[PDB]
């Protein structure tokens, strides 16, 4: 098939992966800490809300509730 080719003005944004990879093992002051630029964008974080508590009830896994 003939393939539509040509130049487009692209642009690179913010929001790279190097300051969004965030992990935590145990205890406060998590070991993989992202850069502190949130700006009214608290999307939960490393939590387990009540919307996610309701999903594992439907599976019926009772020993994952006590573990998590």
């Amino acid at each position: 098939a003939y393939i539509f080719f040509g130049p487009i003005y692209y642009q690179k944004l913010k929001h790279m992966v190097l300051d969004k990879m965030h992990a935590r093992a145990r205890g406060p002051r998590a070991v993989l800490t992202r850069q502190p630029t949130e700006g009214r964008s608290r999307d939960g974080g490393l939590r387990l809300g009540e919307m996610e508590r309701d999903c594992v009830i439907a599976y019926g896994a009772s020993q994952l509730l006590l573990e998590r």
């Binding site: 019926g60 896994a61 509730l65 006590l66």
Partner: peptide
Amino acid sequence: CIILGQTMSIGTGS
């Protein structure tokens, strides 16, 4: 039972 940390009576712990 999730507040007290017990196992639930439905699902797997039935």
